[PDB]
Amino acid sequence: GAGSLALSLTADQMVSALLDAEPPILYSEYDPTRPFSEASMMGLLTNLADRELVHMINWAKRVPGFVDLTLHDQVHLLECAWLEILMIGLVWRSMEHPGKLLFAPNLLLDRNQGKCVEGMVEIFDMLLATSSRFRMMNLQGEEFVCLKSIILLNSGVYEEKDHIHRVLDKITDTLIHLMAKAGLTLQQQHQRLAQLLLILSHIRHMSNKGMEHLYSMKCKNVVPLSDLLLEMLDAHR
Amino acid sequence: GSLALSLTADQMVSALLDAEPPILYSEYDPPFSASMMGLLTNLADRELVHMINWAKRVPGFVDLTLHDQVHLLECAWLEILMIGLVWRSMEHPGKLLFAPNLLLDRNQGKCVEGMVEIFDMLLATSSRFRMMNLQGEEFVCLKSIILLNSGVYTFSTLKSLEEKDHIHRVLDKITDTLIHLMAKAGLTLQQQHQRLAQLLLILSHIRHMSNKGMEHLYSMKCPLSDLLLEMLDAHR
Ligand SMILES: O=S(=O)(Oc1ccc(-n2cncn2)cc1)[C@@H]1C[C@@H]2O[C@H]1C(c1ccc(O)cc1)=C2c1ccc(O)cc1
Numbered sequence: 482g483a484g485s486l487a488l489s490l491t492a493d494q495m496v497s498a499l500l501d502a503e504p505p506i507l508y509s510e511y512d513p514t515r516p517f518s519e520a521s522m523m524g525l526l527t528n529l530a531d532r533e534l535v536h537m538i539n540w541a542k543r544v545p546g547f548v549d550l551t552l553h554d555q556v557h558l559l560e561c562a563w564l565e566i567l568m569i570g571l572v573w574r575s576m577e578h579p580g581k582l583l584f585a586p587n588l589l590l591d592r593n594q595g596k597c598v599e600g601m602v603e604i605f606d607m608l609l610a611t612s613s614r615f616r617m618m619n620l621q622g623e624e625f626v627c628l629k630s631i632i633l634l635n636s637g638v639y640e641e642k643d644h645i646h647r648v649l650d651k652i653t654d655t656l657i658h659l660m661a662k663a664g665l666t667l668q669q670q671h672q673r674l675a676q677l678l679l680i681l682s683h684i685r686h687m688s689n690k691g692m693e694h695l696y697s698m699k700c701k702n703v704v705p706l707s708d709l710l711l712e713m714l715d716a717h718r
Numbered sequence: 719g720s721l722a723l724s725l726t727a728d729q730m731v732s733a734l735l736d737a738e739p740p741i742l743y744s745e746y747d748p749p750f751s752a753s754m755m756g757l758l759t760n761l762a763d764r765e766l767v768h769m770i771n772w773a774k775r776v777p778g779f780v781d782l783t784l785h786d787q788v789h790l791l792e793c794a795w796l797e798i799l800m801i802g803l804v805w806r807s808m809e810h811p812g813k814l815l816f817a818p819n820l821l822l823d824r825n826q827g828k829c830v831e832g833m834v835e836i837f838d839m840l841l842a843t844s845s846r847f848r849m850m851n852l853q854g855e856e857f858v859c860l861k862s863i864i865l866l867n868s869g870v871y872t873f874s875t876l877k878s879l880e881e882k883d884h885i886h887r888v889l890d891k892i893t894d895t896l897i898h899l900m901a902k903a904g905l906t907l908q909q910q911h912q913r914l915a916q917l918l919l920i921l922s923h924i925r926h927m928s929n930k931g932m933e934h935l936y937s938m939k940c941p942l943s944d945l946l947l948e949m950l951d952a953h954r
């Protein structure tokens with residue numbers, strides 16, 4: 482990606498570009514009857530996540546620097562990052578719902594409704610903890626879209642590895658700009674940058690555990706998975 | 719009230735440099751399969767014993783409850799072994815320097831299932847550190863961040879909130895220290911925040927290699943010490 486537009490954006494244009502790329506907030510096409518079974522819970526989340534994936538593909542294309550890559554590399558990055566991206570989206574929209582996960586405006590679950598599925602309460606607790614940390618830090622929308630982009634570009638990274646590195650540097654510059662603009666001292670900026678990036682290691686962690694569980698669910702044959710979802714799972718073995 | 723929070727950048731580096739565990743040699747006899755895992759398990763078990771003593775010397779660690787120190791080490795131990803390996807393996811392209819007397823390349827991983835994928839990720843991590851010219855002082859800051867960070871969001875009472883808050887104050891201190899080192903080396907502010915980000919993004923790859931590694935360590939049971947058996951009960 483030598484010569485790329487992405488690398489000569491201002492911080493403010495990078496943010497404008499990322500804001501314009503944002504997917505819509507999806508409603509669940511079903512309201513659950515009450516209570517949940519394993520199968521009804523995994524049905525709602527699987528259905529919601531398949532629909533989110535379609536919109537995440539359109540978003541990825543509008544991320545500066547993403548479409549500079551080979552289609553091969555674009556596929557690898559989304560295959561590696563998709564559940565981290567669903568997760569950062571979930572913890573962001575759950576920030577104003579303490580103790581609750583806003584899967585959709587018509588699908589708000591507390592940690593208890595996680596108990597009907599094996600291993601799910603542990604994940605919910607880690608998602609809740611991440612949401613609470615974002616609330617404590619007062620994460621801003623402009624910071625969130627920068628982080629979501631870092632996840633996409635970073636999660637499968639290990640000309641075209643150096644290109645991804647130059648785009649990641651540009652997104653770092655953007656976060657620091659946003660922070661300076663908001664009146665943080667140079668010390669507060671560097672500290673907040675580190676705090677946000679250390680949360681990406683927790684999101685990577687939740688994704689690796691999530692994927693283990695999706696693979697167990699696959700073999701269990703509890704719910705139909707879409708061909709797309711099966712592709713994403715085969716990618717992780 | 720932690721003394722960690724009173725240290726200068728230079729004092730934080732000294733404390734972390736002085737905490738470094740000893741360099742271990744492999745002491746398991748050179749079949750070539752049982753014996754690959756044997757090599758690594760015997761070496762890893764011994765490194766773990768020295769990691770427990772290193773952890774007590776990481777500024778801020780000793781201020782935590784015993785229960786929290788245990789949780790932190792159960793979460794971070796494999797990440798800490800892996801960042802050590804990738805540090806030692808920098809000057810040895812295409813190889814993993816497990817010990818001064820135990821240099822493997824990715825072909826050796828083949829003797830075990832799913833180990834070559836981990837070795838490729840470890841090797842690629844080692845090359846990225848080399849490319850970046852990672853300094854010893856940065857490496858010790860990164861290793862301490864992994865210990866304090868990896869378990870912080872999986873501790874819930876009034877005491878825990880104090881614990882989490884102490885950890886966040888110490889992490890901010892280590893952040894100040896990394897920046898100081900970078901400015902000391904004459905990086906511009908821009909280069910400093912870019913280098914900080916590059917280093918911290920690698921930590922998310924180290925977490926990923928640890929998650930993948932713990933999967934294969936758990937299935938490996940399905941010749942391990944009670945210590946290693948204990949450590950797998952955490953990551954169930
Ligand atoms: O870690 S999870 O809680 O997932 C499982 C736990 C146990 C199981 N077992 C099922 N049987 C046995 N175990 C199976 C799965 C994982 C994170 C979160 O809960 C899951 C999930 C999700 C993704 C894709 C999918 O198809 C179905 C579910 C989430 C999610 C996040 C954001 C979003 O916008 C939409 C969905």
Ligand SMILES: O=S(=O)(Oc1ccc(-n2cncn2)cc1)[C@@H]1C[C@@H]2O[C@H]1C(c1ccc(O)cc1)=C2c1ccc(O)cc1
Nearest residue numbers: 758759762799800803830831832833836930931934935938
């Ligand atoms: O991610 S791994 O490659 O782990 C496994 C992969 C496949 C297996 N399979 C076993 N059967 C089939 N696959 C089993 C485990 C992990 C990283 C590296 O190789 C392993 C290992 C290690 C740690 C502890 C232990 O008790 C036994 C082995 C390493 C290590 C790293 C730094 C260090 O300083 C010392 C040791």
